Design a protein around this ligand. Structure first.
Ligand code: CDL
Ligand code: CDL
Ligand code: PC7
Ligand code: PC7
Ligand code: PGT
Ligand code: PGT
Ligand code: PTY
Ligand code: PTY
Ligand code: PTY
Ligand code: 3PH
Lengths: 64, 546, 125, 443, 117, 108
């Protein structure tokens, strides 16, 4: 306590309850994080879908 | 002479950190560090004249093979070509003056030889990075400068904010390092080799350029990765000069210029957004080192756009890198001298007059500031005007918006650099400590970088200097008018009453605060879930009481 | 000036919170959160709602011009065509998807070169 | 074989030394583990790398117990013979010396056996030794010992009838004829997955490791981390992949998702740990998940890269356990809140801690960097996204590693003094091995 | 609005803290000290225009409005002297506390320096 | 001010000596009771698990959710690898009899 009159004392305490985040906030932020940090997975899934729909068009208009 | 540019700063670091330094002390270690940088600079000068001017590249098999399993073959091999010679000349020349400065700036530090050894290791890993001929020895250099940046940013380890700044630099760069590693996997898989001369790509699979761009955006501190760069001011002033001039931030731009496998839309958009963002960020700061840090981020944005423009744009990007290193290191060294003359204060509201600094420090700040703002027929004028004129004739419609962003950024840069000079010297005194530094070593350190600024005007970086891209006088001389507008506004010292815009920009758009809870707190909470609910909960098997 | 005074941080003298490892206590006063701005008052007393509200306008203010020029403006705005090359030099230069010579609307294979510059992501089989 | 009998009989003579001769007991038990290191180095000298896959064979009639050397077994045997004298330097009683001597006999014979019933007999004969080592009365934990023994017994009991099923199916448990006969691969594949997914910590059967690897003494932690986890990997590479390959293809999505969730969830749990030994203990699960996925990729040079990662982990993580053991031995706690400023008070120990922290995070000039690059080459060649998952999550490993280092090493200097000569020489062979295998591993 | 510490103060000290923080925030928002002097004079004249009040409701309304203003205009980058808390020179190279030394620890009780089992 | 060595080496235990000998336990930490209590509680945190609303919801969406995401990604990668290698549809566990294990004597 020899420096409390120079740099401040220990009377003011931290205002935080150390509690977990709310469930909806955690879910929404995790879904945004999955979308941002795993964007090659969505890009490649979209590539597979766009490729298979073209083969569907070919197989549809070919056998007619 | 060729291997002396790479090995020998690493040797200086090894000497000054080992128990050999217990016999030399501070006094002997300063001599060892300065000599070990002078030799490497002389070697790099010889390499520069041989390779750039006489066009004779040299390839050295140094330590045999590193590892070779299947068709994945990594060798301990260097290659010294035009880009490598450019980078080696720049890195060793800047690091020599920074060592000469640091031997006097950190004189009163208790562990001076440890600091000098860390600086030498950082320089040597940068030399290893640019001298490598394949991707894996490049990754040695990449992670080596990352580790040495961690050691040097958090040098004053008893201060918690410095420790957290070093950890932040490591983590932000670790994200981009992961993406760069995945890109190296793509490149090797679809081309069959790791050496640069066998990596000629016309049309690749998109993930290659994107992931290598993300890995470069980490080190060059572009948008959504710039957050570590401002906090890296916790380290001492020589660390900041070497981070912002020659090492670390120029590595991603070097990698993109070397590979040339990007897709230009992402590169142009990222670079121009970064330039405008860092321009408005540096206009609203009062910490003397943070303004210079944001100007570094802005110029890296300029170089990013230029390498987006094309092969000529890639050459202009390397040219602006080379000329930027000299005046940026000079700016940081002059700012360190001004800080030491004012009792350690870094706020520009507590400066003024011409008593707290030497005449040479004020001259250094003035000349490097004039080169940065593109004053005509100085060093930065040639490279910055080349990039601006190349952006004014690109046939991509995206480059139309990028050019406008660059012109606005140029006006902002001439505003806040003139503000940095005005607050430091022109206004009345508002500090209380006048201890001006006039030692020989930091003055000679500044004089060397000013000589390099003159050298870039006298001898160009490449053949683009003097080539005329044919533009009307209105398009050509507009950046001069934007420089004058910034100077007049900053000397008038005018301000606006829109305080909510002022506090949105001065708080740097809240990127750190939004990152404190969009990935970070969720990572902590998901760890709580995986431990408490999973390991202790759902998967836990209890005992059978009897 | 090494050896400056610094105040020490007190040890815990009360029961600890369950998730106490979100405070960084290094031994000196004051400690900090494990990541800055995760809790406690933000600088300038701003909040997350402040930044999200200002960004919900400012983000479209920055993304607006790029969209306009990428969808409502094309190669013909330029007063000149790109740099001209002999056929043996040009034919390898425009193989790069990166090249700015694909914006040459006076080339006889302008469309085919633009159709070959479409970015793909998954390499097909 | 005659040499192995002589080495066992020389090692077992520690019991007959009268206890009042302290110097002789120490020297005899240390030399009894030094000699097999020389013999295994000689076996590496004798190996013909352009010859057959199996060399130096011996088979003991109709008793099972057949032995042979390949590259994976030879590298793992070299690592074990390095690690056991360091364990001898960390013990003080004849009971400890004898437990580690019996463990060395069982590990060395299990690493190179070519019979499945012989592997079963040799490996889990170490169960009661591990129970007594972990649940030692004043300073161990009986809960941890019960957990590790019961999980291992559960997996082994699932395997044992399938072992006997293929034995009745073809007539032998020799791996050279088990790989050439027609067998019902789904049943035996499930039995082998059951043992080796407990030995390698794979979720959900992984909860024994955080208790056991922390409750063990420093020598026990060095052995358990650096050696005993890799018996699951050599189980995969020697027995399961050659004998049930159709199962090994069909189970790949399940093994793949187990490896991915083990990697991610164990990395997420490591961040909230507050015990230094528990921090070091969790980090091993993610590395073993990368090992298992690289083994199961079977794609480019998968055995090579996965064995090299096993060696790199077995060098780096015992050194971290050694540094935590020094801190615990001379400060009587393993709790992070009691340690700060260890750079000023233990500069050599903190330098070693930093170097092995960088090694554990797979930074270059350490064998983990080469290992993780080649493991991700093997994973990438099946699909690019299975490599991307490990690539993008590198910030999560560095977060816990640098957070633990920065919390205990910097700040206000409090804590014990720097390392002794003995502690430095316990650390030193691992550092030399790391520098060599990370700079010039091959010729 | 004021913090829970300032709301616990006596009225005289509450007004004093409000004037002091107003002067400091005017320092933080100004370019120089010579810019700050007439703003300090204007803030002093602003407090002098409410000195002779007696109605506690009007006093409370003025006090609460000024505290809202000070919560609005809290600078995001305050000017702190470097060697104090929040400064750039705080907690850099402190003197080491006394750490104890054990000489020749390996030589004490040799042959019995492991872990018990 | 203890004396644990003779002038020619020879460690002395000092069992009956007045001065406190420096030894292995000299730098053992003084235990803070609340820190010991918090570490004990975190060591036995499985006694605090309860099937309330938040526990059930987070165990469903994160643990089961990401496990299902990883299984779907693994099957996607397996099928895409088999298509990009020239293979037909291959038999994973519970997928009806089909092709497993390509033949090296065959060109796909
Ligand atoms: C950069 C610094 C960042 C923070 C400062 C915010 C500046 C924004 C601004 O509009 O200030 C103008 C601001 C005027 O604000 P003000 O003086 O408080 O208000 C006007 C008067 O009340 C009364 O003035 P007036 O009515 O006589 O007219 C002045 C004003 C028009 O004032 C009005 O009446 C506003 C009506 C709007 C349409 C006209 O004129 C204009 O602004 C026209 C365009 C020039 O100009 C200054 O006096 C400050 C000059 C400092 C440099 C700014 C020069 C422009 C820089 C261009 C790049 C923008 C970068 C920022 C990106 C945004 C994120
Ligand atoms: C017959 C079983 C004998 C073998 C196991 C043994 O000795 O357990 C004794 C021991 C008896 O302890 P206890 O003090 O009576 O407490 C009973 C549970 O804690 C009961 O606590 P609870 O209220 O949390 O139990 C509900 C239980 C839901 O219970 C189940 O899921 C039962 C379905 C099992 C059938 C298999 C499919 O949910 C879980 O505990 C998590 C989901 C389990 C997956 O059982 C356990 O430690 C729990 C068994 C849970 C099995 C799954 C383990 C996951 C890995
Ligand atoms: C599956 C292959 C085995 C590879 C496992 C990884 C090994 C880790 C380290 C890599 C070193 C590479 C060494 C290459 C040359 C050595 C000899 C050699 O060829 O290797 C042997 C085996 O190599 C070894 O045993 C390497 C030993 C590595 C273990 C090192 C760790 C232990 C040292 C600890 C630290 C000691 C420090 C002491 C100093 C104070 C056989 O492997 P292959 O060439 O694949 O066999 C050929 C296959 N066929 C016969 C069918 C044609
Ligand atoms: C002793 C005589 C009886 C031994 C019968 C053992 C049957 C199996 C019991 C469970 C397995 C325990 C094996 C532990 C071996 C290592 C060990 O600790 O050895 C012992 C002695 O163990 C042996 O008997 C070693 C010789 C047998 C193995 C080697 C020869 C055959 C191979 C060392 O002496 P202390 O532990 O100080 O003995 C004190 C006894 N007590 C714990 C009760 C306080
Ligand atoms: C080939 C390389 C071999 C080694 C070369 C490097 C050694 C030269 C630098 C010597 C150590 C620098 C520190 C030093 O000498 O400090 C003095 C600075 O000395 C100098 O005058 C500057 C150093 C010499 C000039 C710079 C040499 C560096 C090499 C680069 C030259 C580029 C041009 C301090 O001042 P003083 O001793 O002159 O004055 C004493 C004081 O007033 C009373 O207490
Ligand atoms: C019940 C007994 C205890 C448990 C069973 C132990 C079985 C013996 C150990 C493994 C025996 C094979 C050793 C590996 C090897 O390659 O051996 C060959 C090479 O010999 C060696 O160099 C053996 C080295 C032994 C030590 C190396 C480690 C292996 C196991 C260690 C056991 C002892 C460890 C002591 C630790 C304290 C065989 O030589 P050979 O001349 O008998 O065979 C050649 C031919 O076929 C004729 O039969
Ligand atoms: C904790 C981290 C510390 C970081 C340390 C710094 C960063 C290091 C990063 C890279 C480390 C690589 C070290 C490799 C060591 C030797 C490997 C090669 C072994 C060998 O036998 O090779 C021969 C040795 O040659 C030679 O070695 C040359 C012969 C002797 C002449 C030069 C002497 C060396 C002077 C170096 C000064 C200080 C430099 C500091 C790095 C060269 O021949 P080959 O068989 O490969 O054949 C091919 C070309 N002929
Ligand atoms: C007072 C404020 C006025 C602001 C404009 C700057 C001074 C320009 C004066 C002027 O009218 O010049 C015109 C420039 O316009 C143009 O055609 C150029 C428009 C863009 C110029 C911006 C940069 C100005 C230089 C600083 C005519 O130009 P001229 O007929 O004199 O030009 C050929 C001889 N060189
Ligand atoms: C699934 C994969 C998820 C990928 C992203 C994961 C990011 C996890 C970060 C964990 C941080 C734990 C350690 C920690 O809090 O350290 C802080 C680092 O902050 C930080 O790391 C803050 C920056 C976080 C940015 C992360 C993304 C950057 C690229 C954007 C895309 C200290 O540093 P501090 O924040 O207290 O700094 C103070 C200087 N003033
Ligand atoms: C570890 C986490 C790593 C992942 C991080 C983030 C990645 C986000 C990925 C999001 C998309 C994943 C891929 C899904 C779209 C592609 C689709 O491929 O095809 C699926 C895949 C491919 O179909 P096919 O290619 O046509 O055969 O479909 C399937 O065959 C699987 C369908 C069922 C999947 C869920 C099964 C239920 C598992 C429950 C696990 C919970 C246990 C809890 C115990 C506690």
């Amino acid at each position: 306590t020899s420096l409390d009159h120079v740099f401040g004392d220990n009377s003011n305490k931290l205002n935080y309850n150390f509690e977990p985040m709310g469930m909806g906030s955690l879910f929404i932020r995790t879904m945004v994080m999955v979308g941002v940090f795993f964007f090659p997975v969505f890009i490649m899934i979209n590539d597979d879908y766009k490729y298979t729909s073209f083969l569907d068009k070919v197989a549809a208009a070919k056998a007619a | 002479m060729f291997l002396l540019s790479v090995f020998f700063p690493l040797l200086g670091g090894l000497v000054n950190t080992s128990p050999i330094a217990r016999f030399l002390g501070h006094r002997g270690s300063s001599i060892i560090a300065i000599g070990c940088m002078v030799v490497a600079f002389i070697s790099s000068v010889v390499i520069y004249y041989e390779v750039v001017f006489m066009g004779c590249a040299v390839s050295v098999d140094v330590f045999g093979t590193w590892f070779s399993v299947g068709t994945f073959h990594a060798g301990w091999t260097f290659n010294f070509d035009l880009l490598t010679a450019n980078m080696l000349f720049t890195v060793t020349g800047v690091s020599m003056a920074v060592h000469m400065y640091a031997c006097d700036y950190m004189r009163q530090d208790p562990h001076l030889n440890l600091f000098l050894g860390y600086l030498s290791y950082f320089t040597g890993f940068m030399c290893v990075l640019v001298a490598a001929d394949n991707l894996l020895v490049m990754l040695v250099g990449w992670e080596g400068i990352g580790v040495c940046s961690y050691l040097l940013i958090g040098y004053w380890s008893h201060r918690l904010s410095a420790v957290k700044s070093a950890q932040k630099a490591i983590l932000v760069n670790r994200v981009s390092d992961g993406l760069l590693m995945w890109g190296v996997l793509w490149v090797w898989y679809h081309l069959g080799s790791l050496e640069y001369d066998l990596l000629n790509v016309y049309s690749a699979s998109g993930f290659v350029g994107l992931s290598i761009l993300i890995g470069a955006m980490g080190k060059s501190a572009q948008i959504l990765f710039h957050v570590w760069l401002a906090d890296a001011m916790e380290g001492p002033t020589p660390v900041s000069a070497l981070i912002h001039a020659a090492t670390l931030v120029t590595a991603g731009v070097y990698l993109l210029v070397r590979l040339h496998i990007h897709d230009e839309m992402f590169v142009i958009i990222v670079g121009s957004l970064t330039a405008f963002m860092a321009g408005v960020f540096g206009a609203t700061q009062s910490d003397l080192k943070r303004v210079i840090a944001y100007s570094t981020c802005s110029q890296l944005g300029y170089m990013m756009v230029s390498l987006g423009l094309g092969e000529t744009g890639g050459e202009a990007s390397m040219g602006h890198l080379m000329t930027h290193a000299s005046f940026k290191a000079a700016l940081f060294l002059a700012a360190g001298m001004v800080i030491s003359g004012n009792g350690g204060n870094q706020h520009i509201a507590r400066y003024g007059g011409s008593a707290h600094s030497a005449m040479f420090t004020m001259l250094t700040l003035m000349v490097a500031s004039l080169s940065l703002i593109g004053w005509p027929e100085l060093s930065g004028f040639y490279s910055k005007e080349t990039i601006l004129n190349l952006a004014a004739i690109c046939a991509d419609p995206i480059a139309d918006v990028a050019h406008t962003l660059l012109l606005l950024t140029a006006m902002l840069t001439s505003a806040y650099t003139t503000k940095l000079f005005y607050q430091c010297f022109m206004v009345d005194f508002s500090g209380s400590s006048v201890t001006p530094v006039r030692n020989v070593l930091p003055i000679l350190a500044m004089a060397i970088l000013l000589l390099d600024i003159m050298l870039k005007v006298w001898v160009g970086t490449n053949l683009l200097s003097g080539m005329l891209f044919f533009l009307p006088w209105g398009v050509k001389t507009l950046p001069f008018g934007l420089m004058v507008a910034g100077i007049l506004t900053a000397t008038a010292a005018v301000g606006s009453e829109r305080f909510t815009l002022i506090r949105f920009c001065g708080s740097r758009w809240g990127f750190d605060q939004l990152f404190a809870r969009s990935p970070v707190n969720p990572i902590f909470d998901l760890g709580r879930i995986t431990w408490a609910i999973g390991d202790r909960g759902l998967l836990s098997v209890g005992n059978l009481r009897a | 000036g090494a050896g400056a005074p610094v105040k020490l941080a007190p040890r815990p003298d009360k029961p600890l919170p369950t998730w106490y490892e979100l405070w960084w206590d290094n031994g000196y006063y004051p400690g900090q959160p494990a990541a800055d701005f995760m809790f406690g008052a933000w600088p300038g007393n701003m909040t997350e709602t402040y930044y999200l509200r200002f960004w919900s306008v400012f983000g479209l203010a920055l993304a607006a011009p790029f969209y306009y020029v990428a969808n409502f403006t094309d190669e013909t705005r330029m007063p000149m065509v790109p740099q001209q090359y002999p056929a043996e030099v040009r034919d390898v230069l425009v193989q790069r998807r990166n090249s700015m010579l694909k914006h040459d609307f006076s080339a006889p294979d302008f469309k085919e070169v633009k159709d070959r510059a479409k970015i793909y992501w998954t390499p097909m089989y | 074989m005659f040499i192995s009998v002589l080495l066992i009989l020389f090692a077992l003579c520690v019991t007959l030394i009268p206890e009042a001769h302290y110097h002789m007991v120490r020297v005899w038990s240390f030399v009894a583990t030094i000699i097999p290191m020389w013999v295994v180095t000689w076996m590496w000298w004798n190996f013909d790398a352009s010859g057959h896959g199996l060399q130096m064979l011996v088979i003991l009639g109709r008793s099972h117990l057949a032995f042979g050397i390949d590259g994976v077994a030879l590298s793992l045997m070299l690592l074990t013979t390095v690690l056991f004298p360091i364990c001898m330097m960390l013990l003080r009683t004849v009971a400890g010396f004898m437990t580690f001597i019996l463990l060395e006999v069982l590990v060395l014979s299990a690493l190179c056996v070519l019979d499945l019933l012989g592997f079963y007999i040799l490996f889990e004969a170490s169960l009661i030794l591990l129970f007594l080592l972990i649940g030692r009365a004043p300073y161990g934990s009986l809960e941890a010992a019960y957990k590790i023994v019961l999980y291992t017994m559960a997996g082994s009991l699932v395997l044992l009838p399938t072992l006997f099923m293929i034995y009745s199916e073809c007539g032998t448990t020799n791996v050279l004829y088990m790989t050439c006969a027609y067998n019902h691969q789904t049943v035996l594949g499930w039995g082998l997955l059951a043992v080796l997914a407990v030995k390698i910590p794979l979720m959900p059967v992984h909860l024994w490791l955080p208790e056991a690897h922390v409750a063990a003494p420093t020598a026990g932690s060095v052995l358990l981390a650096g050696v005993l986890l890799k018996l699951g990997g050599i189980g995969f590479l020697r027995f399961m992949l050659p004998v049930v390959p159709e199962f090994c293809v069909s189970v790949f999505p399940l093994v793949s998702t187990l490896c991915l969730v083990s990697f991610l969830f164990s990395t997420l749990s490591t961040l909230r740990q507050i015990d230094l030994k528990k921090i070091v203990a969790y980090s091993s699960i993610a590395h073993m998940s990368m090992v298992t996925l690289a083994i199961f990729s079977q794609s480019e040079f998968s055995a090579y890269s996965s064995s090299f990662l096993m060696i790199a982990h077995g060098l780096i993580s015992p050194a971290l356990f050694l540094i935590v053991g020094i801190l615990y031995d001379r400060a009587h706690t393993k709790f992070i809140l009691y340690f700060s400023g260890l750079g000023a008070s233990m500069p050599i120990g903190s330098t070693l801690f930093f170097l092995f922290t960088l090694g554990n995070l797979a930074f270059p000039l350490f064998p983990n960097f080469i290992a993780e690059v080649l493991c991700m080459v093997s994973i990438f060649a099946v699909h690019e996204l299975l490599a991307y998952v490990f690539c993008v999550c590198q910030v999560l490993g560095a977060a816990y590693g640098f957070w633990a280092f920065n919390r205990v090493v910097h700040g206000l200097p409090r804590g014990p003094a720097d390392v002794t000569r003995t502690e430095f020489h316990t650390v030193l062979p691992l550092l030399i091995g790391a520098v060599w295998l990370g700079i010039k591993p091959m010729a | 609005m004021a913090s829970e510490v300032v709301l616990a103060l006596p009225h005289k000290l509450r007004v004093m803290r409000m004037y002091r923080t107003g002067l400091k925030e005017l320092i933080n928002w100004s370019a120089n000290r010579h810019e700050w002097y007439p703003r300090a004079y204007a803030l002093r004249q602003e407090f002098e225009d409410s000195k002779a009040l007696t109605d506690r409701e009007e006093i409370r309304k003025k006090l609460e409005h000024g505290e809202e203003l000070l919560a609005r205009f809290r600078h995001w980058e305050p000017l702190i002297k470097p060697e104090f808390v929040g400064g750039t020179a705080y907690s850099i190279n402190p003197a080491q506390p006394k750490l104890k030394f054990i000489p020749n620890y390996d030589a004490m009780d040799e042959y019995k320096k492991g872990d018990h089992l | 001010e203890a004396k644990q060595f003779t002038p020619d080496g020879k460690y002395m235990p000092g069992i009956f000596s007045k001065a406190k000998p420096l030894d292995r336990s000299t730098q053992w930490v003084h235990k803070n009771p609340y820190i010991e209590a918090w570490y004990y509680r975190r060591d036995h945190f499985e006694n605090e698990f309860v099937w309330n609303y938040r526990t059930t919801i987070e165990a469903l969406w994160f643990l089961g959710g990401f496990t299902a995401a990883a299984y779907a990604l693994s099957v996607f990668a397996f099928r895409q690898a088999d298509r990009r290698s020239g293979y037909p549809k291959r038999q994973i566990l519970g997928d009806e009899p089909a092709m497993v294990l390509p033949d090296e004597r065959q060109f796909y």
